[PDB]
């Protein structure tokens, strides 16, 4: 029934900076495992992982693509292990994809360019993998490129990321003369064949051009493995060379418990090092069964709510990590089954929403290709069709299974735009498209701001948002134009107090009712009340009838609620009905509302109060080299600074900036900090700002 044993499963991700070689390494993996009959290349769009039209055209991976391969070895050493690889996008503008996958995966191959080595998004995916506490190996790709330096990149991994990398496969020859790799356990030099596409290779005897460096690093590898358990330490110190099997086992223990990252090297585009990397994956990275059982909660926790072994004997539990659009069935949910067995057509429970879902179809994935499978076992990645309300990080399981797992956090989108269709006969269709897209992508939100009729689109970056826009144009076609979000201001009086009046000639002899009010407005102070409206009752001269003496403030609510100046609200005003006149028979509230409106209008006219723009507080973490640049940008922007701080790993600046401004501030921040700085917003109390648009918006409509 089970086509492959539990132990022979390797769930891994390929994570790195942009254009580090993830998709190329995946393509060579597929070629050398035989599922792909042509190697192809990304820049010509022939990569299988880059299946979306945007990926094919632009040469980048925008989606986490999961596929599966069978690997025996360079020498067919082992029975075919099944590697469930996921090619993740290294763009900072798609970070949820890598976080999404990396939650469920068991290992990560971190790719590093031999020239650049550790880069900003390599550090980003490093942090994500570290917080998920996953084992890593490293693949120094791009060894065929001038300036490549494997040892220097390893030292960059050591110094920058904070790791203690362990060399495992040193490089023979120069950059363009990249002949192959010498393994630091076998003492064999794999040289790949250039006539064919690197499918074949030869083992050579580490020629004299490098026998000292290899010997030294092999001794370092031996002692690194020896520093794993006392049984290894005692014999190492006794002075017999550790056998390769025990070395590999100890290094595997170090990999599982994250003491080290085993770094190999290769050149995927020149077809070298990929099979060696695959054997490194098989030998050193965990399987679904070679880790302590996963954990969750159950009924407000317990001593041990859940300990789910990687085995079929136990009730089904899984995690639905990816949600993807499908034009023909409306959804496709990629889930990893952590423990148990499920079959097509079976019913399960989403422990989060606590509802029944029927697995309409279960398929195995190969890029866009789907193949139907009858059942899924523990430690296996598959895609379900028929789920209709399940979201990312949702636990699908049998009754009495863990409820909440670690996946309940996502990044916050940073770029915000306002999207409007070219044809305004397209509002509902575009809204539906954007809603479903938001449902697939947690880090992307769409909302109609209610101060205007615009619809605001918030994402992780400008690349994220224009990818969303053009994919919306292509699939479920609706055109769209981007613009700027509108601005919600507020007013406040500039310390004005008077005994203003309000009087309308409603009597006219025969109408039978009328009234007159005399009020006072004062500003309290800039932001000392959660209630922007204030009232202090002082109606003494001609006290109106007693049924709504205190209720002549809920009626004045609406004047402050919207539009004394340019249709915008006010804060800090406090109203005080001091005098007035009436008749003590029928004091019509509706008739008094006209007097209230005229009193408010005359009061504003005599106040000549001004507008407060929306200024929020922005807190930015940046390295301590671009501090001057970022604060200079914030100062060229009409923004103020608050507080100086110096983090151990950076510097935190705090500033006050308008909302009409800092449109697309994330891209500018990334430009001026090498994409290695973050910012957050919290909407602090407003401030005065001279803007010519405040009168423009109201004078566009004449008087």
């Amino acid at each position: 029934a089970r086509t492959t044993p539990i132990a022979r499963y390797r769930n891994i991700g390929i994570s790195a900076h942009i254009d580090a070689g993830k998709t190329t390494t995946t393509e060579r993996i597929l070629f050398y495992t035989g599922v792909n009959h042509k190697i192809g290349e990304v820049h010509d769009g022939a990569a299988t992982m880059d299946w979306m039209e945007q990926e094919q055209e632009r040469g980048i991976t925008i989606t986490s693509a999961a596929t599966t391969a069978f690997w025996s070895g360079m020498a067919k050493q082992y029975e075919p292990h099944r590697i469930n690889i996921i090619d993740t996008p290294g763009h900072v503008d798609f970070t949820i994809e890598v976080e999404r996958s990396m939650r469920v995966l068991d290992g990560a191959v971190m790719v590093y360019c031999a020239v650049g080595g550790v880069q900003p998004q390599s550090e980003t995916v490093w942090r994500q993998a570290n917080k998920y506490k996953v084992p890593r190996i490293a693949f120094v790709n791009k060894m065929d490129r001038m300036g490549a330096n494997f040892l220097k990149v390893v030292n960059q991994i050591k110094t920058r990321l904070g790791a203690n990398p362990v060399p495992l496969q040193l490089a023979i020859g120069a950059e363009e003369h990249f002949t192959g790799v010498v393994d630091l356990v076998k003492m064999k030099a794999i040289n790949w064949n250039d006539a064919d596409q690197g499918v074949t290779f030869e083992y050579e005897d580490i020629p004299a051009d490098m026998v000292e460096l290899a010997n030294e690093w092999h001794q370092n590898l031996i002692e690194s493995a020896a520093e794993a358990s006392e049984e290894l330490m005692e014999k190492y110190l006794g002075g017999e060379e550790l056998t390769e099997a025990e070395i590999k086992g100890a290094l595997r223990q170090r990999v599982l418990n994250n003491e080290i990252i085993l770094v190999t090297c290769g050149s995927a585009f020149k077809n070298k090092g990929v099979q060696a990397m695959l054997d490194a994956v098989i030998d050193y990275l965990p399987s679904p069964v070679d880790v302590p059982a996963i954990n969750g909660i159950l009924d407000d926790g317990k001593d041990t709510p859940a300990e789910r072994h990687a085995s079929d004997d136990e009730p089904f539990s899984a995690l639905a990590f990816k949600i993807a659009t499908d034009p023909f069935v409306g959804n496709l949910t990629f889930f990893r089954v952590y423990s148990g067995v499920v079959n097509s057509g079976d019913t399960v429970l989403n422990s989060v929403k606590a509802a029944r879902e029927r697995f309409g179809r279960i398929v195995q994935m190969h890029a866009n290709k789907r193949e139907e499978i009858k059942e899924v076992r523990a430690g296996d990645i598959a895609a379900a069709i028929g789920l209709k309300d399940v979201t990312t990080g949702d636990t699908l399981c049998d009754p009495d299974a863990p409820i909440i797992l670690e996946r309940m956090e996502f990044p916050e989108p940073v770029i915000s735009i306002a999207v409007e269709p070219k044809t305004k006969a397209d509002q509902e269709k575009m809204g539906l498209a954007l809603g479903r897209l938001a449902k697939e992508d947690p880090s992307f939100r769409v909302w109609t701001d209610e101060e205007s009729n615009q619809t605001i689109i918030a994402g992780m970056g400008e690349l994220h948002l224009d990818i969303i826009v053009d994919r919306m144009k292509r699939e479920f076609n609706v055109e769209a134009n981007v613009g700027k979000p509108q601005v919600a201001y507020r007013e406040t009086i500039r310390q004005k107090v008077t005994d203003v009046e309000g009087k309308h000639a409603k009597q006219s002899g025969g109408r039978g009712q009328y009234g007159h009010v005399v009020i006072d407005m004062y500003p309290l102070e800039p932001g000392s009340n959660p209630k922007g409206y204030e009232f202090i009752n002082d109606i003494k001269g001609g006290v109106i009838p007693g049924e709504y003496i205190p209720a002549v403030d809920k009626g004045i609510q609406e004047q402050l609620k919207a539009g004394p100046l340019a249709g915008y609200p006010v804060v800090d005003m406090g109203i005080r009905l001091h005098f007035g006149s009436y008749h003590d028979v029928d004091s019509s509230e509706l008739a008094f509302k006209l007097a209230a409106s005229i009193a408010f209008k005359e009061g504003f006219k005599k106040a000549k109060l001004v507008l407060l723009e929306p200024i929020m507080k922005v807190e930015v973490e940046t390295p301590e080299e671009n501090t001057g640049d970022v604060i200079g940008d914030l100062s060229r922007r009409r923004g103020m600074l608050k507080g100086q701080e110096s983090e151990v790993t950076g510097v935190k600046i705090h500033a006050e900036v308008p909302l009409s401004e800092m449109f697309g501030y994330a891209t500018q921040l990334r430009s001026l900090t090498k994409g290695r700085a973050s910012y957050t917003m919290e909407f602090l109390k407003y401030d005065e700002a001279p803007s010519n648009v405040a009168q423009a918006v109201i004078e566009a409509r004449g008087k």
């Binding site: 305004k424 006969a425 509002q427 509902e428």
Partner: protein
Amino acid sequence: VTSYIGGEGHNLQEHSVILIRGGRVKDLPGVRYHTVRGALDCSGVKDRKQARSKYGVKRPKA
């Protein structure tokens, strides 16, 4: 076609989509249809409490 907007206060702009039902105004000679309030982003009449099913107004808590 020309259609009436019943009730007090609406939000119909120059390109808002709306739902049109039969009827007539009978003193606007030429208006033979009615706009269904509270349907197709034509919000229901504000502060309405009687004949509330017409005018697309929902039941207040009260």
